[PDB]
């Protein structure tokens, strides 16, 4: 997680990170740490680029109605099945036909990319219930 969209990574935020990427439980204490690995830890390998999902919605069987698919707390987004591990390019879009048993229609996902930094910046969402 690069620092440039810090405002999106907040508990009281309505950004795409909350909607379709990462939402936390409201009944348990949760800290968020935005950190960077400047030079020391070479064991951490930087990825190709930062990626996130800015749209995760389902098309109904009428091909006209779109229902957003919000990810629940401590769960994976339903759109990760078609979104690759790293989004290839900014504004990429993916479609998947839905079987009638699953509800019919289509599943549509949209991913965006953020360029790399010199030092890898990461985020920690840490949820809770000495010598």
Automatic annotation (TrEMBL):
Lineage: Viruses, Riboviria, Orthornavirae, Pisuviricota, Pisoniviricetes
Domain commentary: Fusion peptide 1 (FP1) and fusion peptide 2 (FP2) function cooperatively and have a membrane-ordering effect on lipid headgroups and shallow hydrophobic regions of target bilayers. They are considered as two domains of an extended, bipartite FP. The membrane-ordering activity is calcium-dependent and also dependent on correct folding, which is maintained by an internal disulfide bond in FP2.
Ranges of residues in domain BetaCoV S1-CTD: 1-129
Family designation: Belongs to the betacoronaviruses spike protein family.
PTM text: Specific enzymatic cleavages in vivo yield mature proteins. The precursor is processed into S1 and S2 by host cell furin or another cellular protease to yield the mature S1 and S2 proteins. Additionally, a second cleavage leads to the release of a fusion peptide after viral attachment to host cell receptor.
Protein known as: Spike glycoprotein
Disulfide pairings: 56-79
Quaternary structure annotation from Swiss-Prot or TrEMBL: Homotrimer; each monomer consists of a S1 and a S2 subunit. The resulting peplomers protrude from the virus surface as spikes.
Subcellular location: Virion membrane; Host endoplasmic reticulum-Golgi intermediate compartment membrane; Host cell membrane
Source species of the chain: Middle East respiratory syndrome-related coronavirus
Domain of life per record: Viruses
Function comment: Spike protein S2: mediates fusion of the virion and cellular membranes by acting as a class I viral fusion protein. Under the current model, the protein has at least three conformational states: pre-fusion native state, pre-hairpin intermediate state, and post-fusion hairpin state. During viral and target cell membrane fusion, the coiled coil regions (heptad repeats) assume a trimer-of-hairpins structure, positioning the fusion peptide in close proximity to the C-terminal region of the ectodomain. Spike protein S2': Acts as a viral fusion peptide which is unmasked following S2 cleavage occurring upon virus endocytosis.
């Amino acid at each position: 997680y690069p620092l440039s969209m810090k405002s999106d990574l907040s508990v009281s935020s309505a950004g795409p990170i909350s909607q379709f990427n990462y939402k936390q439980s409201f009944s348990n204490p949760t800290c968020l740490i935005l950190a960077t690995v400047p030079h020391n830890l070479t064991t951490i390998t930087k990825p190709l680029k930062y990626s996130y999902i800015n749209k995760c919605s389902r098309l109904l069987s009428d091909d006209r109605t779109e229902v957003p698919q919000l990810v629940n707390a401590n769960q994976y987004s339903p759109c990760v099945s078609i979104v690759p591990s790293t989004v290839w390019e900014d504004g990429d879009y993916y479609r998947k036909q839905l079987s009638p048993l699953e509800g019919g229609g289509w599943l549509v996902a949209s991913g965006s990319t953020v360029a790399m930094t010199e030092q890898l910046q990461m985020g920690f969402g840490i949820t809770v219930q000495g010598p």
